[PDB]
């Protein structure tokens, strides 16, 4: 699965939350965290909106 | 150094080179390095600047290694050095955009006068060489004026301004009645 800043149906983190980057002069160097817990994200839409 | 210029209402183009010709990571960032436009792999990070609403780039060109950057509807504040840091070098464009107008708005008469105003951005030492349908080469700096304005002066005036090795043309529209 692919997602942006936040995934779905995917991995979890093993021990705790850590981060990934280098130098603090200009700092593009995208940072990444693995969040050692889970979260609930659930989207439902049965019909509820028949009018297109 | 490689400048560009604008017209307070136009767009402009700014260039980024790359030897791998491959769409590798470039970022467009102004003087003190805010992020403005950036290749993140196959994506464009509209940076957090004054230009969160304007700037752009031809997107296709990246897979060629030529990464552009445009500043649409330039106002004098988008006038600033930029930078492109494709792989190991940081090509800097420098954009000093202005615009200009005349005092008279809708109503003029024959024998009257009109003046000029060029809205330069700070740090500029230009020179305004301005023209007329009658060949009135108004030779001077910013505030160009003439004590003679006639029915023969009708028609717009090709005004121009030299800011560090370039100029760009200008209307000065003249209409009577």
From TrEMBL, chain A:
Belongs to the HIV-1 env protein family. It is found in: Host cell membrane; Host endosome membrane; Virion membrane. This is Envelope glycoprotein gp160. Surface protein gp120: Attaches the virus to the host lymphoid cell by binding to the primary receptor CD4. This interaction induces a structural rearrangement creating a high affinity binding site for a chemokine coreceptor like CXCR4 and/or CCR5. Acts as a ligand for CD209/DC-SIGN and CLEC4M/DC-SIGNR, which are respectively found on dendritic cells (DCs), and on endothelial cells of liver sinusoids and lymph node sinuses. These interactions allow capture of viral particles at mucosal surfaces by these cells and subsequent transmission to permissive cells. Transmembrane protein gp41: Acts as a class I viral fusion protein. Under the current model, the protein has at least 3 conformational states: pre-fusion native state, pre-hairpin intermediate state, and post-fusion hairpin state. During fusion of viral and target intracellular membranes, the coiled coil regions (heptad repeats) assume a trimer-of-hairpins structure, positioning the fusion peptide in close proximity to the C-terminal region of the ectodomain. The formation of this structure appears to drive apposition and subsequent fusion of viral and target cell membranes. Specific enzymatic cleavages in vivo yield mature proteins. Envelope glycoproteins are synthesized as a inactive precursor that is heavily N-glycosylated and processed likely by host cell furin in the Golgi to yield the mature SU and TM proteins. The cleavage site between SU and TM requires the minimal sequence [KR]-X-[KR]-R. About 2 of the 9 disulfide bonds of gp41 are reduced by P4HB/PDI, following binding to CD4 receptor. Highly glycosylated by host. The high number of glycan on the protein is reffered to as 'glycan shield' because it contributes to hide protein sequence from adaptive immune system. The CD4-binding region is targeted by the antibody b12. The mature envelope protein (Env) consists of a homotrimer of non-covalently associated gp120-gp41 heterodimers. The resulting complex protrudes from the virus surface as a spike. There seems to be as few as 10 spikes on the average virion. Surface protein gp120 interacts with host CD4, CCR5 and CXCR4. Gp120 also interacts with the C-type lectins CD209/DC-SIGN and CLEC4M/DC-SIGNR (collectively referred to as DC-SIGN(R)). Gp120 and gp41 interact with GalCer. It comes from Human immunodeficiency virus type 1. HIV-1 lineages are divided in three main groups, M (for Major), O (for Outlier), and N (for New, or Non-M, Non-O). The vast majority of strains found worldwide belong to the group M. Group O seems to be endemic to and largely confined to Cameroon and neighboring countries in West Central Africa, where these viruses represent a small minority of HIV-1 strains. The group N is represented by a limited number of isolates from Cameroonian persons. The group M is further subdivided in 9 clades or subtypes (A to D, F to H, J and K).
């Amino acid at each position: 699965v692919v997602s942006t800043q936040l995934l779905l149906n995917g991995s979890l983190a093993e021990g705790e939350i850590i981060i990934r980057s280098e130098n603090l002069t200009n700092n593009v160097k995208t940072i990444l965290v693995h969040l050692n817990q889970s979260v609930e994200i659930v989207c439902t839409r049965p019909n509820n909106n028949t009018r297109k | 150094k490689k400048v560009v210029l604008g017209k307070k209402g136009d767009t402009v183009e700014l260039t980024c080179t790359a030897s791998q010709k491959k769409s590798i990571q470039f970022h467009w960032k102004n003087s003190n390095q805010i992020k403005i436009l950036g290749n993140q792999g196959s994506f464009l990070t509209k940076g957090p600047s004054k230009l969160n609403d304007r700037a752009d780039s031809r997107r296709s060109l990246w897979d060629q290694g030529n990464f552009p950057l445009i500043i649409k509807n330039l106002k004098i504040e988008d006038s600033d050095t930029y930078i492109c840091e494709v792989e190991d070098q940081k090509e800097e464009v420098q954009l000093l955009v202005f615009g200009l107008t005349a005092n008279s708005d809708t109503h003029l008469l024959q024998g009257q006068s009109l003046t000029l105003t060029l809205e330069s951005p700070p740090g500029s030492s230009p020179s305004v060489q301005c023209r007329s349908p009658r060949g009135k080469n108004i030779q001077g700096g910013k505030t160009l004026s003439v004590s003679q304005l006639e029915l023969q002066d009708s028609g717009t005036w090709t005004c121009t301004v030299l800011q560090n090795q370039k100029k760009v043309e200008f209307k000065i529209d003249i209409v009577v009645l």
